[PDB]
Amino acid sequence: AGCLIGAEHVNNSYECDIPIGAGICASYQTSQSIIAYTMSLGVENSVAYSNNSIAIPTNFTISVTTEILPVSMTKTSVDCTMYICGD
Amino acid sequence: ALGKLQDVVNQNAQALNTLVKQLSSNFGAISSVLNDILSRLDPPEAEVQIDRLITGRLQSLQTYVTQQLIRAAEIRASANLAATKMSECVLGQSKRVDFCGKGYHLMSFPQSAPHGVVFLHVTYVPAQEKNFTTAPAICHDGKAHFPREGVFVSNGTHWFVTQRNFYEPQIITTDNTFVSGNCDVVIGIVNNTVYDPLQPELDS
Amino acid sequence: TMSLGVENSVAYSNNSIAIPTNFTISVTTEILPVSMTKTSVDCTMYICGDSTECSNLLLQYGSFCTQLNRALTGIAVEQDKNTQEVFAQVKQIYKTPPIKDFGGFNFSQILPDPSKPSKRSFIEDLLFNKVTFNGLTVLPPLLTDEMIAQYTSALLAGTITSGWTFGAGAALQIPFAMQMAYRFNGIGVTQNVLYENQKLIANQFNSAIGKIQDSLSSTASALGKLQDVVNQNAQALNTLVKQLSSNFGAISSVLNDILSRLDPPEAEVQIDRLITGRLQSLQTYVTQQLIRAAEIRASANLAATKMSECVLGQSKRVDFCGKGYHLMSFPQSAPHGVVFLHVTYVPAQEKNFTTAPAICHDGKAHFPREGVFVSNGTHWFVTQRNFYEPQIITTDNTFVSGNCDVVIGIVNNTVYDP
Amino acid sequence: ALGKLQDVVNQNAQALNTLVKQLSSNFGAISSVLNDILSRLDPPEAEVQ
Amino acid sequence: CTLKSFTVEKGIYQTSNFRVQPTESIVRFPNITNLCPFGEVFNATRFASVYAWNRKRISNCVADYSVLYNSASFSTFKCYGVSPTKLNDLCFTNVYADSFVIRGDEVRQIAPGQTGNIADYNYKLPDDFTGCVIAWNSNNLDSKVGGNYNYLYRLFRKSNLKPFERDISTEIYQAGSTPCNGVKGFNCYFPLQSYGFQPTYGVGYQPYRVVVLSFELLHAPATVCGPKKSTNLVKNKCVNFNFNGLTGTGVLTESNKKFLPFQQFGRDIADTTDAVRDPQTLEILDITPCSFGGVSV
Numbered sequence A: 001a002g003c004l005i006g007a008e009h010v011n012n013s014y015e016c017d018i019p020i021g022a023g024i025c026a027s028y029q030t031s032q033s034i035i036a037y038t039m040s041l042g043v044e045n046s047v048a049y050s051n052n053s054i055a056i057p058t059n060f061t062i063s064v065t066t067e068i069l070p071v072s073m074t075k076t077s078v079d080c081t082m083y084i085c086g087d
Numbered sequence B: 001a002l003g004k005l006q007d008v009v010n011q012n013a014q015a016l017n018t019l020v021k022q023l024s025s026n027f028g029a030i031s032s033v034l035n036d037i038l039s040r041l042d043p044p045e046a047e048v049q050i051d052r053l054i055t056g057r058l059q060s061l062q063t064y065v066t067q068q069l070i071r072a073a074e075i076r077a078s079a080n081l082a083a084t085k086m087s088e089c090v091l092g093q094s095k096r097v098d099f100c101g102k103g104y105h106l107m108s109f110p111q112s113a114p115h116g117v118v119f120l121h122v123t124y125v126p127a128q129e130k131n132f133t134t135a136p137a138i139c140h141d142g143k144a145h146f147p148r149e150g151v152f153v154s155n156g157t158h159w160f161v162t163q164r165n166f167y168e169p170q171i172i173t174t175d176n177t178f179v180s181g182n183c184d185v186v187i188g189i190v191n192n193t194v195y196d197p198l199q200p201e202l203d204s
Numbered sequence C: 001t002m003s004l005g006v007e008n009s010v011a012y013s014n015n016s017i018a019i020p021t022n023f024t025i026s027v028t029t030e031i032l033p034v035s036m037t038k039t040s041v042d043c044t045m046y047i048c049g050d051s052t053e054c055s056n057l058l059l060q061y062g063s064f065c066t067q068l069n070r071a072l073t074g075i076a077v078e079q080d081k082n083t084q085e086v087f088a089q090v091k092q093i094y095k096t097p098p099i100k101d102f103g104g105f106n107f108s109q110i111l112p113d114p115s116k117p118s119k120r121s122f123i124e125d126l127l128f129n130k131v132t133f134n135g136l137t138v139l140p141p142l143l144t145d146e147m148i149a150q151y152t153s154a155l156l157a158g159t160i161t162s163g164w165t166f167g168a169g170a171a172l173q174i175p176f177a178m179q180m181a182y183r184f185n186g187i188g189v190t191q192n193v194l195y196e197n198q199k200l201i202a203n204q205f206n207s208a209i210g211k212i213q214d215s216l217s218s219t220a221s222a223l224g225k226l227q228d229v230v231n232q233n234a235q236a237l238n239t240l241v242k243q244l245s246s247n248f249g250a251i252s253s254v255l256n257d258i259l260s261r262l263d264p265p266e267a268e269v270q271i272d273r274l275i276t277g278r279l280q281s282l283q284t285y286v287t288q289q290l291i292r293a294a295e296i297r298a299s300a301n302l303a304a305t306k307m308s309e310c311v312l313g314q315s316k317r318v319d320f321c322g323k324g325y326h327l328m329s330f331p332q333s334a335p336h337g338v339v340f341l342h343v344t345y346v347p348a349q350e351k352n353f354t355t356a357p358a359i360c361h362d363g364k365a366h367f368p369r370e371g372v373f374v375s376n377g378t379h380w381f382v383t384q385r386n387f388y389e390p391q392i393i394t395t396d397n398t399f400v401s402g403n404c405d406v407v408i409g410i411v412n413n414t415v416y417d418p
Numbered sequence D: 001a002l003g004k005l006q007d008v009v010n011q012n013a014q015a016l017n018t019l020v021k022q023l024s025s026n027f028g029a030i031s032s033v034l035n036d037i038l039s040r041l042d043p044p045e046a047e048v049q
Numbered sequence E: 001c002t003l004k005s006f007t008v009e010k011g012i013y014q015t016s017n018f019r020v021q022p023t024e025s026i027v028r029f030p031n032i033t034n035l036c037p038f039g040e041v042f043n044a045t046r047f048a049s050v051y052a053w054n055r056k057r058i059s060n061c062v063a064d065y066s067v068l069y070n071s072a073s074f075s076t077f078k079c080y081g082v083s084p085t086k087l088n089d090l091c092f093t094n095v096y097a098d099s100f101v102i103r104g105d106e107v108r109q110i111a112p113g114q115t116g117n118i119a120d121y122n123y124k125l126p127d128d129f130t131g132c133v134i135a136w137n138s139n140n141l142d143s144k145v146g147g148n149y150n151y152l153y154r155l156f157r158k159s160n161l162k163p164f165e166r167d168i169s170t171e172i173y174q175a176g177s178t179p180c181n182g183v184k185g186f187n188c189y190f191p192l193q194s195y196g197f198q199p200t201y202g203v204g205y206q207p208y209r210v211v212v213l214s215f216e217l218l219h220a221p222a223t224v225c226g227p228k229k230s231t232n233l234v235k236n237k238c239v240n241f242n243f244n245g246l247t248g249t250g251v252l253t254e255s256n257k258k259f260l261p262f263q264q265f266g267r268d269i270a271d272t273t274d275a276v277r278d279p280q281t282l283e284i285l286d287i288t289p290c291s292f293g294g295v296s297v
């Protein structure tokens, strides 16, 4: 993305905290300092796939997640003449 | 938490502030105050500056109205999505994945918010999974057996038939399963006994 | 005068039913733009590139440049968000096992190729091969093409290895043939059909994938949807740049010529016209860019919905994940966009049959539990609706409801008692 | 009930009408008719208007 | 300050722009060795008649315009598209010096878009005229006691002149439908009218000598330049270069582009000069913008 000055490049990989670009992100970590690193895409996880193995849940959880959606906005009106030629 | 609503509010506030602050631009006139021009200039000269002020303010107003139209279109899209979700998640149980929250949707609860809505999505999340050995079908008497509902599993020595999203192993019977053809076709079929509930009753 | 399709009069009657005896597996390509190029414009350089007097004159317009810059920044962040939402739908990075024992199904050309330096599949390589200083800068996308490829690979691996379980929660492995059985059940086909034609189904799927490869390798107009977008973007920039050659009433279109030619009192008069024209052009560009970004956002929302409902699940919506009864989908990253390979089930070979709504055995009306009653001319069977598999009409195939004086078209036949 | 359609039509019509009516505006010129300017003023003064 | 708050939230913010401001300015003019013969235009004994306004072409010379505009001998000096004080910094492809004599009241007619007898039948300037109109009172020269009849202006014409069009015909104007056949008479007029300048005339009728300089800045190589010296050629550095009036900022480097001998520069899609030929040592230089881009915190 360019030249980065003032961030210590780190060979470790963490979640993206401040996006810099091209997979490079920056964080503030320990004597704390700004560090730059290649972001980790999730935790990698290979599925134990085979042609005769199946994974079945023995339990469950009830999750309640919040979603927020704007519905309307403020009803504004502008008197064009007053705005341009106020009185 | 309600970052999206505050974003809309801030956008509208910023737009209005810009619209107002543009009234301070001279746009090439001696002053940005119309009353200073009228109290300072005669009509022949006053009109020249007033024309510049009118041009600038009209352009600003057109820009604001265009931006408002676009933002209003975005809000209308969001609200259409919101009404669709209200219907399909509160008035019914949706099969669409991730439409009413992450997980198998159970229900949704609406809560009013300033200029918006919040949906509490109650979903069912499998929690504690375990490994098992499975087979597509089973051979009992030269016949291939398939689960009516569920999947065949093995705990290492014994074979059961359990529902697909919860481990409830059950003895594989002729009521759990159904037959189709023989065992020379299915790939992965295993040998096991299919219990007949009628047999003990007839024998006794 | 163009023909509207081929005309076709369906052989409709009140006791005739057409039932497929065979089927085909169709893999179709759908292409959706996901993002556009993140473009930023230095308004002050664009209008008054390196000119102090022009910048001073430009100050008279207040905050026109800063809100244009804000708009473009919003657009670029929105492109990043669109890519994130479309592709970052999977929590973990799933990698497929080295042994490709998938019941005969072959994903070699859609799975990442280790030899390629990027984790890019053969089809994505085809896709990427096909699609092709005045304050104007291009900001790189947040996620690299390699990262989008990684996400696509993870999605494909999870789908192949665990069916639709990984989308909901933890990926639960399942044999792929049994997953196809589950999907056959989902579309309404008994899973014994999948097992009994597993080789045929796998061969059809491989053939369809190869045909997709051939179509991509041969014809490129299919990706026009993506290319179109790029072209539009390019065109706009061209327009913007070309506007800098317009005099807009000034003696010259070059600020350096005017400044080296005109005194400030006279130079400013000319510079004002150029400032006006270039400002108007920038406003036009930003407005149209906002509109196009809105269109792209709509497209990306559609694409994310399709990823969710076709790749992470099996949709019952008609024609939302391809034409035919949807079986599954596979995602492939594309430049600024995504491609979905929709695997669908299409009934192929249909036979005529005589059909009845119910059957009388002992004065009772019998109706099918699942399926439909058919007759081959002399004998009556009961078969599942989407595939011809006649069976002896027994008390387990059917259920009784009322008597035979009500149903219109009910017929007489023996109902077997096991 | 068909308002949803008619409105669209009206919208389009309205826009076109507005466009047409904008050809009747002086915008500071002595006339909103181009031929009148051309038929009465020399090109140097015609261009200004 | 960009967020206009005493608090910056976690993130990355584009705050300013970075530029490798040019280190030095480079001037590259051709090795021109000729002075522009403006004396025979501004110092001619007898200027031509307005209807037969004289035109001279100036090319391949250097002119010190400081002498011209520092002179106090002119009553009218109006430059459209250009200023007197800046001509010394510029190179023009060609210049045209059109000289003639009119009266004072007609001097106002020598301007872009002016309408009048002179602007209609004698001498017309285009509306996009770039150049300078310089007029001075020549009463001491062009005025005779008995009346100077050597200057004639066209008073009758069928239609107005195109810009920079000369008509020297003396054909009898036929005001009516009756042909004249070269005979003066009723509805038959001689188009040329004598000024008859006399020393006793008022300022509005005294002779005025008018010279119109038309500077043409085309894409062709420049041949009329000011008294500007070329500096050394600096490469591999951010400089503010000036090649024959083509000013710009960038890095000049040797290029492998195979320019044909008649070719002087190459352009880009944006009509931006990607390469130039040095006017003195005919080598091809690539022009590459120095360095710039957003600065994010």
Ligand SMILES: *[C@@H]1O[C@H](CO)[C@@H](O[C@@H]2O[C@H](CO)[C@@H](O)[C@H](O)[C@H]2NC(C)=O)[C@H](O)[C@H]1NC(C)=O
Binding pocket: A058, A059, A060, A061, B128
């Ligand atoms: C399934 O998980 C739930 C928790 O989500 C378990 O319930 C917990 O059981 C432990 C031990 O019995 C208690 O200490 C906790 O208080 C319980 N939690 C709740 C919320 O009730 C449950 O036992 C698990 N079931 C199985 C079969 O593993």
Ligand SMILES: *[C@@H]1O[C@H](CO)[C@@H](O[C@@H]2O[C@H](CO)[C@@H](O)[C@H](O)[C@H]2NC(C)=O)[C@H](O)[C@H]1NC(C)=O
Binding pocket: B155, B156, B157, B158
């Ligand atoms: C698999 O399941 C079977 C059935 O539950 C297990 O066999 C039972 O094991 C319990 C252990 O206490 C005994 O009490 C029962 O009498 C057994 N029943 C039969 C029919 O064998 C078997 O042990 C399980 N195997 C594994 C490896 O878990």
Ligand SMILES: *[C@@H]1O[C@H](CO)[C@@H](O[C@@H]2O[C@H](CO)[C@@H](O)[C@H](O)[C@H]2NC(C)=O)[C@H](O)[C@H]1NC(C)=O
Binding pocket: B139, B191
């Ligand atoms: C499942 O059971 C069947 C029959 O009980 C097995 O088929 C036998 O296979 C052996 C070995 O080839 C033959 O000698 C027998 O003649 C077969 N029996 C019949 C009735 O055909 C089959 O091999 C078993 N499958 C497994 C995996 O053990």
Ligand SMILES: *[C@@H]1O[C@H](CO)[C@@H](O[C@@H]2O[C@H](CO)[C@@H](O)[C@H](O)[C@H]2NC(C)=O)[C@H](O)[C@H]1NC(C)=O
Binding pocket: C021, C022, C023, C024, C200, C203, C204, C349
């Ligand atoms: C269903 O259709 C498939 C074709 O898609 C048939 O398989 C073909 O059968 C013919 C003749 O038996 C062969 O020449 C082809 O090579 C086969 N193609 C494939 C891909 O297998 C199949 O026989 C049909 N089945 C029924 C019951 O009609």
Ligand SMILES: *[C@@H]1O[C@H](CO)[C@@H](O[C@@H]2O[C@H](CO)[C@@H](O)[C@H](O)[C@H]2NC(C)=O)[C@H](O)[C@H]1NC(C)=O
Binding pocket: C100, C106, C107, C108, C109
């Ligand atoms: C999946 O398909 C690929 C290509 O369609 C197969 O790779 C081919 O393998 C054959 C050998 O059987 C070679 O002759 C070809 O040159 C290969 N082509 C390519 C493009 O690699 C692959 O073998 C198939 N998978 C399986 C399990 O057979």
Ligand SMILES: *[C@@H]1O[C@H](CO)[C@@H](O[C@@H]2O[C@H](CO)[C@@H](O)[C@H](O)[C@H]2NC(C)=O)[C@H](O)[C@H]1NC(C)=O
Binding pocket: C376, C377, C378, C379
């Ligand atoms: C309708 O189907 C029935 C049963 O499938 C057919 O009757 C069988 O016909 C075959 C010859 O095709 C004989 O080998 C069987 O013995 C018959 N079974 C019985 C119970 O009769 C019948 O021929 C079919 N009719 C038509 C017109 O297709």
Ligand SMILES: *[C@@H]1O[C@H](CO)[C@@H](O[C@@H]2O[C@H](CO)[C@@H](O)[C@H](O)[C@H]2NC(C)=O)[C@H](O)[C@H]1NC(C)=O
Binding pocket: C360, C411, C412
């Ligand atoms: C199906 O069978 C029933 C009886 O098995 C038929 O009912 C007979 O209808 C005729 C004329 O309507 C009567 O004369 C008989 O008395 C009826 N039989 C009984 C037992 O009541 C019925 O008609 C048959 N369906 C068709 C279409 O022929």
Ligand SMILES: *[C@@H]1O[C@H](CO)[C@@H](O)[C@H](O)[C@H]1NC(C)=O
Binding pocket: A009, A010, A011
């Ligand atoms: C990171 O690892 C590379 C080798 O892979 C090494 O050359 C480099 O010095 C390391 N950087 C840091 C900051 O440890």
Ligand SMILES: *[C@@H]1O[C@H](CO)[C@@H](O)[C@H](O)[C@H]1NC(C)=O
Binding pocket: A048, B129, B130, B131
């Ligand atoms: C399933 O079995 C494999 C056997 O190699 C084991 O490694 C894996 O951890 C098991 N799955 C879980 C969730 O424990």
Ligand SMILES: *[C@@H]1O[C@H](CO)[C@@H](O)[C@H](O)[C@H]1NC(C)=O
Binding pocket: A051, A052, B187, B188, B189, C101
């Ligand atoms: C499953 O894969 C293993 C891998 O070696 C193979 O030996 C076995 O035959 C396969 N089972 C079936 C039913 O195909």
Ligand SMILES: *[C@@H]1O[C@H](CO)[C@@H](O)[C@H](O)[C@H]1NC(C)=O
Binding pocket: C011, C018, C350, C351, C352
């Ligand atoms: C079914 O029979 C009708 C009887 O005329 C015929 O027209 C029609 O083509 C048949 N359907 C098919 C699919 O062949």
Ligand SMILES: *[C@@H]1O[C@H](CO)[C@@H](O)[C@H](O)[C@H]1NC(C)=O
Binding pocket: C014, C015, C408, C409, C410
């Ligand atoms: C079908 O319609 C015909 C007349 O078109 C009628 O005679 C016949 O009884 C009908 N069949 C059934 C099963 O209702």
Ligand SMILES: *[C@@H]1O[C@H](CO)[C@@H](O)[C@H](O)[C@H]1NC(C)=O
Binding pocket: E031, E280
């Ligand atoms: C002008 O050109 C001659 C060669 O024709 C060269 O020797 C001389 O140095 C040049 N003079 C300048 C001032 O560049």
Ligand SMILES: *[C@@H]1O[C@H](CO)[C@@H](O)[C@H](O)[C@H]1NC(C)=O
Binding pocket: E038, E039, E042, E043, E067
């Ligand atoms: C015009 O003539 C005067 C007197 O001969 C002279 O001093 C002046 O420099 C001349 N002007 C030009 C431009 O040659």
